[PDB]
Amino acid sequence: GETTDGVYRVMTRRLLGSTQVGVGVMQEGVFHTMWHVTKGAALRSGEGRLDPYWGDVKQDLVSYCGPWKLDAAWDGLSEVQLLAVPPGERAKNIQTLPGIFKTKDGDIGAVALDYPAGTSGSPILDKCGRVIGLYGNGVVIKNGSYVSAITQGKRE
Amino acid sequence: DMYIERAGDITWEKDAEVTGNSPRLDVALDESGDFSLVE
Ligand SMILES: Cc1cnccc1NC(=O)c1cc(C2CC2)n(C)c1C
């Protein structure tokens, strides 16, 4: 399969036509996505198979081929870029200032942008192009719009 | 069956579209990994 670093689409044929269920990050030979995209299933790349290595339904994260590699963090100050990859549309950089999700276990960056659910696992970047987490787990607000947690794993 | 297709390099882009607000929200995270508004 293709194992060059970069941002991928996650597709299924188990429905009408070819459907984009989500997005992920290829880094250092490991594929990184949200658990709600794949539900922990194996993935094809060319005639290559990618097998799940690590996952956690509560973090809503999953890695393929190896352990989670992405460890950069939101500074808590600077704007970020969502590298949004929407269904049938070209990858696009959207720059935004995160707000905060306040939780009993600590504060978390959040990004206040609407896109189709097949966008899930788009990477969020800092100014040096490091992935500080994945977009597409969060909360619906009064307006009916989505607000997403900046969702990061941990590198052991 | 699920497959991947490369969509781009991971790069900061000068003069990307600059949008979205910076909301401060009280939230709870359940064991199924679903966030909810603690209102
Ligand atoms: C499917 C799922 C399962 N489990 C947890 C979260 C989700 N995520 C969504 O339901 C979702 C994601 C987005 C966009 C930011 C990508 N939008 C608007 C919604 C409603």
Q: Which domains does chain A have, with CATH numbers?
A: 6-64 (2.40.10.120), 80-151 (2.40.10.10)
Residue A12 has phi, psi (to 5 degrees) of -130, 150
| 3-class secondary structure, A131 | strand
The answer for A 16-75 residues in CB contact with B (under 8 A) is 21, 23-27, 31, 35-36, 38, 41-45, 50, 56-60
In which order are the strands placed within the sheet that holds A48-50?
A48-50, A43-45, B2-8, A6-12, A19-27, A30-33, A61-64, A52-56
Amino acid at A123: P
Cα gap A98→A76, rounded to integer Å: 8
Ligand 1 within 6 A of CB of A115: yes
| 3-class secondary structure, A9 | strand
The answer for B 9-28 residues in CB contact with A (under 8 A) is 9-13, 16-28
Cα gap A14→A11, rounded to integer Å: 9
- State the CB neighbour count (10 A cutoff) for residue A38: 24
Cα gap A94→A25, rounded to integer Å: 17
Q: Which of B4, B19, B37 sits opposite A94 (nearest CB)?
A: B19
What technique was this entry resolved by?
Answer: X-ray
Cα gap A53→A34, rounded to integer Å: 13
Ligand 1 within 6 A of CB of A112: no
